[PDB]
Amino acid sequence: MKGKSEEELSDLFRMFDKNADGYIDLEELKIMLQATGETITEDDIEELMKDGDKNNDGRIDYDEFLEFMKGVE
Amino acid sequence: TQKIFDLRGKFKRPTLRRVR
Ligand SMILES: [Ca+2]
Ligand SMILES: [Ca+2]
């Protein structure tokens, strides 16, 4: 009944949360842009983060982050 | 308009091929 999907991000979030708290912000969001280092940096981070923190609270936790990779499909 | 860049790739499944 169960499937391999949560375990994937479960390990990603742990490594993604360099701040060590449980949520991701503009600071950590850079972790994805750092791989490209394109112009999107210092700009796209503020617009991209909007995807993760789609709760209107001011931070993204282990949940909405799963929607990120979801786009990969 | 793109949004996709690396973030998408290498995010399907963890594969490890041993030298064997
Ligand atoms: Ca954090
Ligand atoms: Ca949120």
PDB file of C-alpha atoms and ligand atoms in Angstrom:
ATOM      1  CA  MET A   1       0.000   0.000   0.000  1.00  0.00           C
ATOM      2  CA  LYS A   2       2.917   2.322   0.756  1.00  0.00           C
ATOM      3  CA  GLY A   3       5.290   3.708  -1.856  1.00  0.00           C
ATOM      4  CA  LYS A   4       8.699   5.338  -2.220  1.00  0.00           C
ATOM      5  CA  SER A   5       8.175   9.101  -2.399  1.00  0.00           C
ATOM      6  CA  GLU A   6       8.337  10.669   1.063  1.00  0.00           C
ATOM      7  CA  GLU A   7      11.636   8.975   1.914  1.00  0.00           C
ATOM      8  CA  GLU A   8      13.180  10.745  -1.077  1.00  0.00           C
ATOM      9  CA  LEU A   9      12.438  14.276   0.125  1.00  0.00           C
ATOM     10  CA  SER A  10      12.786  13.173   3.752  1.00  0.00           C
ATOM     11  CA  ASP A  11      16.534  12.990   3.141  1.00  0.00           C
ATOM     12  CA  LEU A  12      16.578  16.090   0.939  1.00  0.00           C
ATOM     13  CA  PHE A  13      14.910  18.389   3.477  1.00  0.00           C
ATOM     14  CA  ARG A  14      17.384  17.242   6.133  1.00  0.00           C
ATOM     15  CA  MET A  15      20.293  18.302   3.923  1.00  0.00           C
ATOM     16  CA  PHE A  16      18.406  21.306   2.547  1.00  0.00           C
ATOM     17  CA  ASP A  17      17.751  22.710   6.020  1.00  0.00           C
ATOM     18  CA  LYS A  18      21.351  23.878   6.409  1.00  0.00           C
ATOM     19  CA  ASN A  19      20.059  26.285   9.058  1.00  0.00           C
ATOM     20  CA  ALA A  20      18.966  23.293  11.141  1.00  0.00           C
ATOM     21  CA  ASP A  21      15.455  24.284  12.216  1.00  0.00           C
ATOM     22  CA  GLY A  22      12.861  22.517  10.091  1.00  0.00           C
ATOM     23  CA  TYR A  23      11.835  25.197   7.590  1.00  0.00           C
ATOM     24  CA  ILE A  24      13.248  26.818   4.445  1.00  0.00           C
ATOM     25  CA  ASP A  25      13.514  30.522   3.624  1.00  0.00           C
ATOM     26  CA  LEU A  26      15.180  32.879   1.141  1.00  0.00           C
ATOM     27  CA  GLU A  27      18.467  31.930   2.813  1.00  0.00           C
ATOM     28  CA  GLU A  28      18.117  28.188   2.223  1.00  0.00           C
ATOM     29  CA  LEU A  29      16.173  28.628  -1.020  1.00  0.00           C
ATOM     30  CA  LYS A  30      19.498  29.802  -2.450  1.00  0.00           C
ATOM     31  CA  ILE A  31      20.756  26.235  -2.030  1.00  0.00           C
ATOM     32  CA  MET A  32      18.927  25.363  -5.261  1.00  0.00           C
ATOM     33  CA  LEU A  33      20.116  28.461  -7.124  1.00  0.00           C
ATOM     34  CA  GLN A  34      23.699  28.000  -5.924  1.00  0.00           C
ATOM     35  CA  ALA A  35      23.856  25.000  -8.263  1.00  0.00           C
ATOM     36  CA  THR A  36      23.181  27.228 -11.272  1.00  0.00           C
ATOM     37  CA  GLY A  37      24.551  30.554 -10.074  1.00  0.00           C
ATOM     38  CA  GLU A  38      22.673  32.295 -12.879  1.00  0.00           C
ATOM     39  CA  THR A  39      21.105  35.761 -12.925  1.00  0.00           C
ATOM     40  CA  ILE A  40      18.013  34.292 -11.254  1.00  0.00           C
ATOM     41  CA  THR A  41      20.000  34.588  -8.020  1.00  0.00           C
ATOM     42  CA  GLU A  42      19.223  37.539  -5.746  1.00  0.00           C
ATOM     43  CA  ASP A  43      15.791  37.888  -7.348  1.00  0.00           C
ATOM     44  CA  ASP A  44      14.217  34.575  -8.341  1.00  0.00           C
ATOM     45  CA  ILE A  45      14.742  33.439  -4.745  1.00  0.00           C
ATOM     46  CA  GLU A  46      12.112  35.893  -3.505  1.00  0.00           C
ATOM     47  CA  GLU A  47       9.655  34.789  -6.194  1.00  0.00           C
ATOM     48  CA  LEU A  48      10.484  31.079  -6.030  1.00  0.00           C
ATOM     49  CA  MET A  49      10.167  30.832  -2.238  1.00  0.00           C
ATOM     50  CA  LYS A  50       6.520  31.752  -2.824  1.00  0.00           C
ATOM     51  CA  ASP A  51       6.064  28.190  -4.078  1.00  0.00           C
ATOM     52  CA  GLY A  52       7.330  26.501  -0.929  1.00  0.00           C
ATOM     53  CA  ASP A  53       5.738  28.730   1.696  1.00  0.00           C
ATOM     54  CA  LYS A  54       2.248  28.608   0.190  1.00  0.00           C
ATOM     55  CA  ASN A  55       0.585  28.854   3.604  1.00  0.00           C
ATOM     56  CA  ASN A  56       1.033  32.604   4.141  1.00  0.00           C
ATOM     57  CA  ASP A  57       2.907  32.136   7.420  1.00  0.00           C
ATOM     58  CA  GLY A  58       6.417  33.278   6.543  1.00  0.00           C
ATOM     59  CA  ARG A  59       8.245  29.967   6.165  1.00  0.00           C
ATOM     60  CA  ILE A  60       8.076  26.526   4.551  1.00  0.00           C
ATOM     61  CA  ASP A  61       8.228  23.260   6.509  1.00  0.00           C
ATOM     62  CA  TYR A  62       8.500  19.550   5.696  1.00  0.00           C
ATOM     63  CA  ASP A  63       5.330  19.327   3.598  1.00  0.00           C
ATOM     64  CA  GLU A  64       5.052  21.987   0.903  1.00  0.00           C
ATOM     65  CA  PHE A  65       8.674  21.208   0.041  1.00  0.00           C
ATOM     66  CA  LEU A  66       7.416  17.925  -1.394  1.00  0.00           C
ATOM     67  CA  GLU A  67       5.448  19.911  -3.974  1.00  0.00           C
ATOM     68  CA  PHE A  68       8.769  21.247  -5.276  1.00  0.00           C
ATOM     69  CA  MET A  69      10.051  17.921  -6.594  1.00  0.00           C
ATOM     70  CA  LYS A  70       6.472  17.089  -7.607  1.00  0.00           C
ATOM     71  CA  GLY A  71       7.006  19.286 -10.649  1.00  0.00           C
ATOM     72  CA  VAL A  72       9.766  16.906 -11.711  1.00  0.00           C
ATOM     73  CA  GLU A  73       7.017  14.451 -12.661  1.00  0.00           C
TER      74      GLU A  73
ATOM     75  CA  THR B   1       9.598  31.517 -18.571  1.00  0.00           C
ATOM     76  CA  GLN B   2      11.265  28.347 -17.290  1.00  0.00           C
ATOM     77  CA  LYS B   3      11.666  27.906 -13.516  1.00  0.00           C
ATOM     78  CA  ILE B   4      13.210  24.465 -14.081  1.00  0.00           C
ATOM     79  CA  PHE B   5      16.969  24.118 -13.650  1.00  0.00           C
ATOM     80  CA  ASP B   6      18.751  21.192 -11.986  1.00  0.00           C
ATOM     81  CA  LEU B   7      16.101  21.297  -9.251  1.00  0.00           C
ATOM     82  CA  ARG B   8      14.047  19.064 -11.535  1.00  0.00           C
ATOM     83  CA  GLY B   9      16.801  16.767 -12.758  1.00  0.00           C
ATOM     84  CA  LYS B  10      18.359  14.251 -10.380  1.00  0.00           C
ATOM     85  CA  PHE B  11      15.173  14.370  -8.304  1.00  0.00           C
ATOM     86  CA  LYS B  12      13.390  11.229  -9.497  1.00  0.00           C
ATOM     87  CA  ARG B  13      15.138   8.408  -7.637  1.00  0.00           C
ATOM     88  CA  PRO B  14      18.503   7.635  -5.984  1.00  0.00           C
ATOM     89  CA  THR B  15      20.537   5.211  -8.094  1.00  0.00           C
ATOM     90  CA  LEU B  16      23.977   3.820  -7.260  1.00  0.00           C
ATOM     91  CA  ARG B  17      25.939   1.652  -9.693  1.00  0.00           C
ATOM     92  CA  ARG B  18      28.717  -0.345  -8.029  1.00  0.00           C
ATOM     93  CA  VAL B  19      31.964  -0.735  -9.968  1.00  0.00           C
ATOM     94  CA  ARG B  20      31.576  -4.522  -9.798  1.00  0.00           C
TER      95      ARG B  20
HETATM   96 CA    CA C   1      15.837  26.758   7.746  1.00  0.00          CA
HETATM   97 CA    CA C   2       4.240  27.365   4.845  1.00  0.00          CA
END
